[PDB]
């Protein structure tokens, strides 16, 4: 939700590189200090890839993907459509409530058979 504010607020983006340039944020040591201890130019001033916020989003995004279900994939791409249609939190919930029976079928694709096989294969999963 903070990153939602980040994307929906251009002013927060505009002063983001401001804070980077007056603080001389390298954004290389902050992402490679661990790699330095493991014994392993273009936008060095600031770039989208060096945004620490999009970094913390992408580092633990699969936790969010993990906590969802593989039969809800088509629910994700229909939600990609509604978000491209600029639908906010209120109307996406009610449209998904209409799309409750639109969820994917495990018999519809072989990939869903093994995905559900491992998804309940994790001990921390409950069907409720």
């Amino acid at each position: 939700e903070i990153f939602i504010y980040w994307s929906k607020s251009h002013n927060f983006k505009r002063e983001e590189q401001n804070f980077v340039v007056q603080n001389e944020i390298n954004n290389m040591s902050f992402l490679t200090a661990d790699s330095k201890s493991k014994m392993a130019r273009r936008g060095d001033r600031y770039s989208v890839q060096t945004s620490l916020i999009v970094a913390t989003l992408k580092k633990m995004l699969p936790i969010g993907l993990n906590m969802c279900a593989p039969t809800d994939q088509d629910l994700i791409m229909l939600a990609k459509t509604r978000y491209a249609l600029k639908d906010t939190d209120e109307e996406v919930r009610e449209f998904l409530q209409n799309n409750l029976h639109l969820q994917g079928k495990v018999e519809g694709s072989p990939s869903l058979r093994w995905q559900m096989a491992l998804y309940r294969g994790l001990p921390g999963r409950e069907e409720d």
Binding site: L65, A117, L122
Partner: peptide, 13 residues
């Protein structure tokens, strides 16, 4: 699929 070790950690999600 169950025989894999680090697939759950990376790739599956």
């Amino acid at each position: 699929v169950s025989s894999l070790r680090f697939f759950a950690i990376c790739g599956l999600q």
